[PDB]
Design a protein around this ligand. Structure first.
Ligand code: HEM
Ligand SMILES: Nc1nc2c(ncn2[C@@H]2O[C@H](COP(=O)(O)OP(=O)(O)O)[C@@H](O)[C@H]2O)c(=O)[nH]1
Ligand code: SF4
Lengths: 1233, 225, 509
């Protein structure tokens, strides 16, 4: 009795009667103990999280702290995690959880009515889709409610029916799927990709699409992306966080950065605003956003001056000598009173061809320290067609003897020629400062004359000299354009950059000096962490090359604790063990990979509103009338030249091409080329609106494409979906502009191209809202999968804590069932077909040495159409459509027959297969009898684990063996002491496992050295997959030299002309004003995920918000949290303001991905629901990103291609007046003044 | 009538007193987590300072008067505190407390019913209980003009007689009420009904008046238990 | 001299990344219920700012903490026992729901059920979790000022700006911000306890964790005003107040608190501190508030002094608690290195959650600078966060201990650089702040490397002592409702017996 207890207990008092110790009951404490106790814990997630189940339900999560500890002298990774991660648990039974397959009512009514008239689903689908009033009646319903509960049985059938009908009439490449960042869930991504690959559908890219891909990387190293791990940051004694908000966007790793500061490391933050990153540094430099290349140029300048010229550094000098293309000889072209730098000199050009008979035109040439001319090792030429010479030992490629390349001709040149260099620091808009000099700057370079193998004479100079020239270093030749002092305002001096950036010159100097001093002192331990702050501007290449040159001049790349650290959206490390599973390369070769930016630019018809003309991007030294047309024209050319991929590829059902060739008496391959020339078969790209060259079916999973990553949201909604939109400007047609000269024009563009949009998700996202079918997928806590990362070397799993709730299914099970149903519904429509598949010239493949000296358009008769060389390959792929489900659920024979490989090497993996047959069991019978199985995600994961070198020490050694041939250097020691190692899915479940060093990457998994990108290049003398085989400072490809990017040069942010035509056009009465619209990754979500999560919304501002500086806010009459509208040509968005001082006047930030489903009122500019951040952006491709068939500049899924840059964008901002929700609730408002 | 008379004043008071006592005990032993005052102040501070203070200070005056008024025997200062002097004290002192209480009561009730935050989170008993007290207080005040007609204290003498019979368990306690004005009957019935509905409402906070606090040491430490 | 132990917490602000992970994990476990959904036991605040609740640091408005009368005695700023008792029918200082934020939710189901043919794209609008009504607009949140969100004039209202000319800080080039993650202090002289009329709040003797007994609390809601950190949250639904419980369920077994184990920035340190409970009043009643910090330090006891070991033993401190007390990182930082400081020691509560102040980018100056006594690294004088600001937050206005901490943090940086870059042993910096090579090395070990086993040194609360673990092990958890838990007298009205007990007594003695 608690009542009887009262009548009873006062122990001693303490603190002079200030206190009293009571001996009383405390059983009530069980209450909170009973909440903490749970049913068990499960590991799942790039951070292993412990899932706590309680009462049979997932209640919460915490970080796993059992990662294998790092060297004693390094902090450990535990616990990792982030606020977004910690709130995931919310999604499971939230009010926004997708429980059942959903279908648009209008579409369901016509579907059931059709099935009743057509016993066959394909015919029933054909009846609806072929009717213009039916097709449109449900395409217009998109994004306008109407979802009704459906069933797996129903949607699966409708989906397969639609897929068959589309493949059968238009072709497999009219079916596509978009899925991103595979490292997050290898198998979940592989599921839809495998099904699409098998049936021939196109698989869209994402790395270049998000603009996470740094083009400068393939340019300089011929590697899409490879960086040091966060642990390695701790081995750096000098760090600059440049355009990378580390604590907010790299949260789980930030501690390596805050902790290394205690080891004596100095840190500097370079951001235009006072970012969270600034809070943790020793210095804060705030350049005007988008003007960073300048600052980097001035710093590079100071370094070259003080560490290469005035007082030369033994370390930096040897480094640039043996690892860059600086000593390589560049040919000079002739002009009107001066010269222009041309392509690099190829051994070929020389009489004796320097003895190199194999790929002489693909080998670079330099001068040894004895004045003799030599073709050194490592150049791309030695990669294919010969052996043991593709290494970085400083040797004469001709006599196999140790030599020594020289850097500067100065002091032994024949004469002093004047070379012109392009300068853009004078162009730009009104919002950025400009320094006027001359469009072309003439510098005096020390030259030399050579006798070409064809009699003609030509002038040469080194990349090295050309560089110091371009930086403005006076070298004695009394050059009026070089600098006399850092104070002298010239081509890239500190004083120069102080005007562009607004950063005091004394700062540029001090830091540049410390940064280099440190690199000299520690031998390369200076690092630069860089992110979207720089990589999302149109001229990202210039910002990155700016940063890269500083690092190379200080010999930091390839050195633990130094280098280029690019971190953004992750890294699927066990690649080659995953590529065959995700793209069914174990059954058929090849698949249809597509670069998404060109894809959407074309199909969402964003090219029809282009404002940017290639002309205004040409070098002032280029044949302006040799580069004409719309930017989309350059793409079409790039496609038919084998540079970029196509989708749809051909303007005719590729399944019918084989059958027509047989009647021609010639094979499909040769018959296609004939037709292509004759104009019989055309590239679909040439006619995207004809009616049969547009995609018809789109699958979206692990993405929110139409509400997040989808740049040009309104264009996407209008042309791809066919619903209302908020586009504000007129198109090329309505304005009168010039039509492309490679693409059909039509005053009224085709709309609602997508016939069927299927989205997989666990939450009703913005994308789902505008979908036709929502498939309820399982959360990361209800399925098995794997994860790897750029930040660390651990591979851990995703595990089902409980079974998917309600009717959810794993992405794997979802595509498995669609495959199964597709297999039966296709019977009698598609059998064992033959498919003609175009394939762009691949990087890391012998074909990458296509066009060595110039550019030849076969359609312009400039050469013959040669698949694999001056056009894409024309492949033959046999597809067993009824055998799809069987192929999907089994490991193909090709692995046993043809083997497996990547990044240029290839090995035998028969043993692996025999092991798989044992762990996954095999097919009892059927089309894939005896083959290992792929029934569950575990099987698939074990396939990836057993096949990849990164996770199998046995495939790891076979790999290094394969590469060893190419280099002539033994590399197997890198894996030998881990050869018995084999990572099993069930093993990583008990504890995350570090991976095995592989040739697929350049950093190392070692116990004495951290994983640092480029380390294998610098320490094992393995070449950088580039023309010269070294770090490429000089881009000698036609397009690069003519677009002014042979050497990096400052490039002001571009003008998108998206504001002056709409500003003031629909006044509401409040002042309007143009502001730079920046959208850095946010703090309350990862892209769009979490942007609907109540925990995140409560910790943020409660829904879509945009940040404005205090001045900009007051000038517009905007108070904190006022409703405001941001809009331009592309569209409009509604949100609330966050007024703050840390935002520099002039710019505005609407943190990336807050989407269209929560807290958005009707817009006053479109009379529709307000838009999202991408309602104001638009794709605008850059030529230099379309280059192909050229060594490091050859294609590769996610390796190269047009990017979705958007920081250059400007919008109109203004306070709102009427706040109408458009929901008939009668709960509207009006903001005054 | 005589039946209803004996039920309400001879039987009902023992049912409500039995339920009141055993119900408070049982809910204290098995409902500790439910033993609270249930403050709503934080949800809406408007007029709470005034209103709640008025109500509580008024209600407390009543209770003190009602307590010493009817539970103190006559021979105790029969000379210094005769029944008619007690009536004058209750009519004026207790009556002023009544007006305060009634005003605070009403303001709080207006609030509970019309302030969206308090109404959305309220329970039914909170309304039933607050409404009966407001009604009970208004009844109590309407009895004043009746007692003003018996300044000799004859009316109070009857009621006091009834009360004292009840609390000492003497049967026939309702006889003391022969003649008393009906108004008083209603007050007595509605009043005892609050003792009945007491253990099933927020009124249990009353048992918890923090008097021990005035002499407690500031710091408290519980040992291992 | 009564020695008692407690596991204190030290947060290194220099490493805090302002991520809020800590706040979420706590919310998921402890406060996701209706009634405390707006409460954040652990909440992080960006400074300058007025915090959550708004301006909680303003004791003149909220009346939190203690005051020292002229006679030298201690009294809650709320008023003495009678003064406080008199404010019971309506706490005139109580912070209102709006002071925190109206807890909201969104109508997600509209996205799903929106009917065919809607004029516009459906949307999910905000809705009050208190009224259930549609909210015209979310006007506040618990972390609303996050990252300098809001005009400077509004933010600078921050109480810690008192006595500082804040005009210069509204300038772009002088911008500065830091994060203040906070939980309950679990004070030695807590104000909440002294301000709870029913005596429902108490401090546990074995581990010093302060809890609001959910059985005995009567919802008198005075404690809320009494807490100067405003870390006690009224649960609008149950009618009782709840607060951070220091994760005692885990601490009792020797585990870290959830917000400690889950700190991504690896900034939280958990260690035992031994204090003389008999000196609480004397230290807390010191005449000059600038002496409370030191006077508190004096209340802590050297876990390696045998005189203390023997008194500890004698006083009931478990051996292992004493052991861990000697390897306590919290002790090393508050006592030896003087890097950890208390939060608002002027409230006279003798707080047990301390902080290491943060470093910052050097201030904006005319030229790019000159090497200071620390070379390329910063000198304490060049840091941009105004030291007086920090002092107002941690040392009652005294910049001395704040500078000492910062100066040492920097000293360590200088000594380590000499070692890892130049490869030389330079103790110039160390000698200047009075640190030895060894101490800087140990500082580095704990601050930089921060191995899990070094960040958390939590002993068991020994729940076996003074109780009967055995029958508990056997029958705890079977919550069938035996109606006998929570009282010492065995007699009960429903004629029952405890499930986790033995009622058949031994007759063999
Ligand atoms: C079962 C409980 C109660 C009993 C037996 C009772 C009895 C009485 C009696 C006999 C009187 C008239 C005084 C006389 O002339 O003898 C009275 C008056 C009054 N009562 Fe009550 N009462 C009760 C409860 C309450 C309550 C709960 C309230 C407050 C809402 C209240 C408010 C008043 C007021 C305002 C007056 C008139 C002024 C006065 O005489 O103090 N009573 N009550
Ligand atoms: N130096 C520099 N910093 C920028 C620029 N634009 C934005 N920033 C800052 O750098 C950060 C980088 O942006 P965000 O897209 O979040 O990048 P992430 O951290 O790489 O994911 C932002 O949060 C800004 O504070 C820029 O043009 N230059
Ligand atoms: S988790 Fe740690 S680093 Fe992140 S906000 Fe909380 S205390 Fe700061």
């Amino acid at each position: 009795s608690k009542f009887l207890d009262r009548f009873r207990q006062k122990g001693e008092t303490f603190a002079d009667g200030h206190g009293q110790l009571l001996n009383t009951n405390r059983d009530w404490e069980d209450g909170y103990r009973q909440r903490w106790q749970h049913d068990k814990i499960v590991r799942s997630t790039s951070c292993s999280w412990k899932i706590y189940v309680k009462n049979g339900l997932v209640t919460w999560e915490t970080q796993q702290t059992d990662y294998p500890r790092t060297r004693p002298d390094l902090p450990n990774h535990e616990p990792r995690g982030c606020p977004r991660g910690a709130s995931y648990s919310w999604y499971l039974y939230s009010a926004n959880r997708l429980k059942y397959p959903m279908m648009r009512k209008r579409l369901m009514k016509m579907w059931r009515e059709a099935k009743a008239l057509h016993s066959d689903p394909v015919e029933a689908w054909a009846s609806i889709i072929e009717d213009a009033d039916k097709a449109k009646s449900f395409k217009q319903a998109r994004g306008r409610g109407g979802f009704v509960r459906s069933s797996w049985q129903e949607v699966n059938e409708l989906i397969a029916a639609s897929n068959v009908y589309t493949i059968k009439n238009y072709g497999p490449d009219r079916v596509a799927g978009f899925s991103p960042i595979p490292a997050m869930s290898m198998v979940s991504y592989a599921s839809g990709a495998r099904y699409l690959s098998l049936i021939g559908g196109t698989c869209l890219s994402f790395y270049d699409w998000y603009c996470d891909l740094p083009p400068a990387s393939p340019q300089t190293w011929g590697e899409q992306t490879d960086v040091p791990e966060s642990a390695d940051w701790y081995n750096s004694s000098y760090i600059i966080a440049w355009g990378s908000n580390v604590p907010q966007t790299r949260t789980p790793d930030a501690h390596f950065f805050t902790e290394v500061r205690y080891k004596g490391t100095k840190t500097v933050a370079v951001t235009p605003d006072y970012a969270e990153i600034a809070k943790l540094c020793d210095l804060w430099l705030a350049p005007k956003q988008g003007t960073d290349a300048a600052m980097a140029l001035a710093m590079g300048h100071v370094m070259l001056r003080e560490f290469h010229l005035d007082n030369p550094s033994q370390y930096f000098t040897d480094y640039v000598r043996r690892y860059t293309d600086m000593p390589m000889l560049v040919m000079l072209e002739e002009r009107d009173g001066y010269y222009a730098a041309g392509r690099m000199l190829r051994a070929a050009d020389l009489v004796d061809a320097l003895g190199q008979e194999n790929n002489p035109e693909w080998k670079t040439v330099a001068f040894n320290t004895n004045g003799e001319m030599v073709a050194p090792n490592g150049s791309i030429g030695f990669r294919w067609g010969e052996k043991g010479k593709w290494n970085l030992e400083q040797r004469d490629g001709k006599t196999g003897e140790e030599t020594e390349l020289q850097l500067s001709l100065l002091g032994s040149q024949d004469e002093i020629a004047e070379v012109g260099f392009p300068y853009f620091g004078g162009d730009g808009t009104e919002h950025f400062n400009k320094v006027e000099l001359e469009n072309v700057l003439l510098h005096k370079l020390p030259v030399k004359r050579l006798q070409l193998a064809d009699g003609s004479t030509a002038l040469v100079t080194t990349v090295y000299d050309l560089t110091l020239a371009n930086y403005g270093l006076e070298r004695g030749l009394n050059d009026v354009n070089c600098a006399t002092s850092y104070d002298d305002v010239k081509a890239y001096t500190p004083a120069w950059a102080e005007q562009i950036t607004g950063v005091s010159r004394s700062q540029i100097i001090r830091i540049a000096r410390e940064f280099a001093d440190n690199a000299d002192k520690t031998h390369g331990r200076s690092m630069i962490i860089v992110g979207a702050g720089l990589n999302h501007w149109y001229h990202l290449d210039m910002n990155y090359r700016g940063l890269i040159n500083m690092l190379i001049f200080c010999g930091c790349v390839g050195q633990s604790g130094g280098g280029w650290a690019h971190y953004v959206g992750e890294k699927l490390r066990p690649q080659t063990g995953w590529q065959p599973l995700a793209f069914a390369l174990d059954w058929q070769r090849p698949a249809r990979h597509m670069n998404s930016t060109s894809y959407f630019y074309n199909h969402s018809s964003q090219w029809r509103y282009e404002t940017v003309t290639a002309e205004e991007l040409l070098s002032p030294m280029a044949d302006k009338s040799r580069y004409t047309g719309h930017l989309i024209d350059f793409n079409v050319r790039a496609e038919r030249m084998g540079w970029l991929p196509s989708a749809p590829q051909l303007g005719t059902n590729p399944l019918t091409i084989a059958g027509e060739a047989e009647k021609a008496g010639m094979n499909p391959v040769d018959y296609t080329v004939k037709s292509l020339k004759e104009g019989s078969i055309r590239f679909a790209a040439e006619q995207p609106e004809n009616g049969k060259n547009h995609p018809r079916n789109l699958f979206i999973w692990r993405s929110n494409l139409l509400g997040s990553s989808g740049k040009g949201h309104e264009f996407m909604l209008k042309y791809l979906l066919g619903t209302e939109h908020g586009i504000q400007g007129k198109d090329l047609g309505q304005q009168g502009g010039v039509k492309p000269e490679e693409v059909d024009w039509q005053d009224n563009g085709l709309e609602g191209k997508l016939d069927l949009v299927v989205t997989l998700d666990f939450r009703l996202s913005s994308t789902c809202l505008y979908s036709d079918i929502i498939l309820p997928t399982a959360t990361w806590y209800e399925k098995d999968d794997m994860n790897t990362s750029d930040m660390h070397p651990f591979i851990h799993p995703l595990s089902a804590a409980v079974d998917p709730a309600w009717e959810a299914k794993s992405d794997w099970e979802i595509y498995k069932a669609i495959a199964k149903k597709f297999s039966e519904v296709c019977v009698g429509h598609l059998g064992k077909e033959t498919d003609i598949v175009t394939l762009p010239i691949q990087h890391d493949s012998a074909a990458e040495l296509a066009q060595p000296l110039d550019v030849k358009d076969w359609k312009k008769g400039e050469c013959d159409l040669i698949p694999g060389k001056t056009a894409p390959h024309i492949m033959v792929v046999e597809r067993d459509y009824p055998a799809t489900y069987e192929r999907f659920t089994s490991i193909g024979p090709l692995m046993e027959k043809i083997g497996n490989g990547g990044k240029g090497i290839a090995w035998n993996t028969q043993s692996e297969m025999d092991l798989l047959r044992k762990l996954n069991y095999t097919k009892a019978e059927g089309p894939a009898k005896g083959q290992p199985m792929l029934n569950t995600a575990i099987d698939a994961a074990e396939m990836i684990l057993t096949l990849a070198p990164e996770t199998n020490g046995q495939v790891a050694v076979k790999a290094w063996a394969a590469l060893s041939e190419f280099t002539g250097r033994d590399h197997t020691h890198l894996a030998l002491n881990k050869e018995d190692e084999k990572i099993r899915f069930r093993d990583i479940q008990a504890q995350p496992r570090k991976i095995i060093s592989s040739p697929t990457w350049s950093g190392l998994e070692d116990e004495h050295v951290s994983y640092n990108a480029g380390y294998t290049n610098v320490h094992e003398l393995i070449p950088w997959r580039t023309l010269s085989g070294r770090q490429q400072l000089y881009q000698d490809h036609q397009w690069m030299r003519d677009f002014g990017e042979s050497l990096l040069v400052y490039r002001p942010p571009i003008d998108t002309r998206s504001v002056k035509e709409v500003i003031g056009q629909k006044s509401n009465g409040n002042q309007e004003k143009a502001l730079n619209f920046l959208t850095p990754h946010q703090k309350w979500g990862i892209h769009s995920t979490y942007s609907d999560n109540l925990l995140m919304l409560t910790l943020g501002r409660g829904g879509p918000v945009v940040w404005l500086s205090e001045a900009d806010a007051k000038d517009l009459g905007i108070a904190d949290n006022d409703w405001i509208e941001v809009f331009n040509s592309n569209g409009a968005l509604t949100a609330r303001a966050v007024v703050s001082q840390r935002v520099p006047a002039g710019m505005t930030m609407m943190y990336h991905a807050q989407e269209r489903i929560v807290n958005l009122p009707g817009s006053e500019i479109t009379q529709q629901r307000g838009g999202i951040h991408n309602s104001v952006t638009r794709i605008t491709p850059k030529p230099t990103h379309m280059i192909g068939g050229y060594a490091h500049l050859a294609y590769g899924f996610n390796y190269y291609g047009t990017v979705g840059s958007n920081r250059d964008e400007f919008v109109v901002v203004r306070k709102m007046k009427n706040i109408d929700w458009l929901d008939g609730e009668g709960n509207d408002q009006v903001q005054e003044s | 009538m005589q039946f209803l008379n004996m039920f309400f004043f001879d039987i009902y008071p023992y049912i409500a007193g039995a339920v009141f006592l055993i119900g408070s005990w049982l809910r204290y032993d098995y409902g500790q987590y439910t033993w609270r005052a249930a403050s709503s102040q934080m949800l809406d501070r408007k007029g709470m300072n005034l209103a709640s203070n008025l109500f509580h200070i008024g209600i407390l005056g009543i209770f003190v008067g009602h307590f010493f008024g009817m539970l103190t025997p006559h021979w105790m200062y029969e000379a210094w505190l005769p029944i008619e002097v007690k009536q004058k004290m209750a009519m004026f002192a207790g009556g002023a407390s009544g007006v305060l209480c009634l005003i605070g009561g009403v303001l709080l009730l207006k609030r509970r019913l019309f302030s969206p935050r308090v109404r959305a989170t309220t329970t039914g008993a909170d309304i039933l209980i607050l409404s009966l007290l407001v009604i009970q207080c208004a009844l109590g005040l309407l009895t004043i003009p009746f007692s003003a007609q018996h300044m000799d204290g004859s009316e109070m003498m009857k009621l006091v007689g009834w009360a004292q019979s009840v609390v000492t368990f003497h049967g026939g306690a309702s006889q003391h009420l022969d003649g008393v004005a009906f108004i008083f009957r209603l007050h007595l019935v509605l009043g005892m009904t609050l003792f009945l509905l007491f253990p099933f409402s927020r009124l249990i906070h009353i048992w918890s008046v923090p008097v021990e606090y005035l002499t407690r040491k500031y710091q408290l430490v519980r040992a291992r238990h | 001299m009564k020695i008692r132990s407690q596991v204190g917490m030290v947060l290194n602000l220099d490493k805090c990344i302002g991520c809020h992970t800590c706040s979420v994990t706590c919310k998921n476990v402890w406060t996701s219920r209706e009634g405390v959904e707006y409460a954040w036991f652990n909440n992080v605040e960006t400074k300058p700012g007025q915090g959550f609740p708004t301006d909680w640091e303003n004791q003149e408005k909220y009346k939190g903490g203690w005051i020292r009368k002229i006679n030298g005695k201690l009294q809650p700023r709320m008023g003495n026992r009678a003064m406080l008792l008199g404010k019971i029918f309506a706490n005139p200082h109580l912070p209102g729901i709006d002071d925190y934020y109206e807890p909201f939710d969104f109508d997600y189901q509209n996205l799903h059920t929106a009917p065919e043919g809607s004029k516009s794209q459906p949307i999910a609008r905000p809705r009050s979790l208190i009224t259930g009504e549609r909210m015209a607009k979310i006007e506040k949140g618990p972390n609303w000022e996050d990252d300098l969100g809001g005009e400077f004039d509004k933010l600078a209202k921050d109480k810690n700006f008192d006595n500082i000319q804040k005009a210069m800080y509204s300038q772009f080039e002088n911008t500065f911000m830091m994060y203040l993650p906070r939980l309950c202090e679990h004070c030695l002289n807590p104000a909440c306890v002294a301000t709870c009329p029913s005596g429902a709040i108490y401090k546990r003797e074995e581990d010093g964790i302060v809890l609001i007994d959910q059985d005995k609390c009567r919802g008198w809601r005075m404690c809320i005003t009494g807490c100067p950190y405003k870390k006690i949250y009224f649960n609008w639904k149950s009618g009782k107040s709840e607060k951070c419980i220091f994760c005692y369920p885990r601490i009792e077994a020797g585990q870290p608190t959830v917000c400690s184990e889950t700190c991504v920035g690896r900034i939280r340190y958990l260690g035992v501190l031994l204090y003389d409970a008999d000196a609480i009043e004397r230290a807390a009643s010191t005449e000059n508030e600038k002496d409370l910090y030191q006077r508190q330090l004096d209340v802590f006891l050297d876990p390696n002094d045998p005189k203390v070991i023997e008194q500890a033993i004698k006083d009931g401190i478990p051996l292992s608690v004493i052991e861990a007390a000697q390897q306590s990182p919290v002790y090393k930082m508050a006592m030896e290195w003087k890097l950890a400081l208390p939060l608002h020691p002027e409230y006279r509560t003798l707080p047990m959650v301390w902080y290491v102040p943060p470093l910052s980018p050097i201030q904006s100056a005319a030229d790019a600078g000159e090497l200071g006594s620390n070379g390329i690294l910063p000198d304490v004088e060049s840091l941009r966060i105004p030291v007086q600001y920090l002092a107002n937050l941690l040392t009652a206005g005294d910049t001395k201990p704040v500078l000492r901490a910062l100066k040492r943090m920097l000293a360590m940086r200088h000594y380590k650089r000499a070692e890892t870059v130049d490869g030389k042993v330079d103790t110039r910096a160390l000698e200047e702040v009075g640190l030895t090579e060894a101490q800087a090395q140990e500082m580095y070990r704990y601050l930089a490397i921060a191995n899990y086993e070094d960040r958390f040194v939590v002993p068991s609360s020994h729940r076996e002592l003074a109780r009967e673990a055995f029958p508990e092990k056997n029958g705890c958890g079977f919550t069938f409702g035996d109606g006998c838990h929570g009282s010492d007298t065995k007699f009960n009205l429903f004629n029952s017996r405890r499930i986790d007990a033995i009622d058949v007594t031994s007759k063999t003695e």
